[PDB]
Amino acid sequence: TAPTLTVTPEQQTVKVDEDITFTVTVEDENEVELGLDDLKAKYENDIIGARVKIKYLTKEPNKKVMEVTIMKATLADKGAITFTAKDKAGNQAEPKTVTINVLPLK
C-alpha cells in the first residue's frame, strides 16, 4: 500500500516573538523514511543552534511522529516546509506542506 502522511496544523498564523509548532506523522506496513530535506534546508543552523527543536514523539520503524517547534518567530519564519514519505518498496506517499504566516506585533 501507500504510506500515510499527515501534518498538523496544515496552516497556522502567529505573531512575532511567538513559538510555532507543527507535528508530522508517517506510518505504513513497512519501514518508512521521513523526508527531512526541506526542513533541514530551511532551518539548518536553527536546528543546530537549538532555536528549532525536533522532538520524536514516536520513532518506530513503520511509524514516526515528529514535533517541530520554531521558537521566537521572526517575519522570516513565514514560509512553507514540504515533507515526503516512502516505504522500502519505493511506494511514495502524497507530499504535504506546512504553511506558516508571521504577523507584525503592531
Add this chain to the structure above:
Amino acid sequence: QLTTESMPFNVAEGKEVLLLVHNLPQQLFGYSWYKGERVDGNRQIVGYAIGTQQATPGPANSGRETIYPNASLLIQNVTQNDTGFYTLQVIKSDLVNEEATGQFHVY
C-alpha cells in the same frame, strides 16, 4: 556512549584546552557546543554544519573558541570565566540528538 575529554583537564590561565569527542555517531547533521550543563541557544558557543562544512559562532563565542569537523572544541587564551561545564549536542541525520557534557578547571 558519546563522551568528551578535556586535554588538559587542568589548564593554566592563558593556555589552550582541546575538548576531544570520541564516540561520534554514524550519520551526522551538525555539532554545537554550549557553555554550562544544559543545551540552550542563548549559551551556544559555536555551531558546525556537516553540509556546509562551516562553523558559525553563537552568543557565547568570545572569538577564542573554534569547532572542528571532528566535533572537538579548542579554547585559546583561556580565562577564569572559561572554567566550568560545557555541553556538546550532536544532531544526527535522523534529526535525533545525542548529548555529552565535559568540563575543565583553570588554575
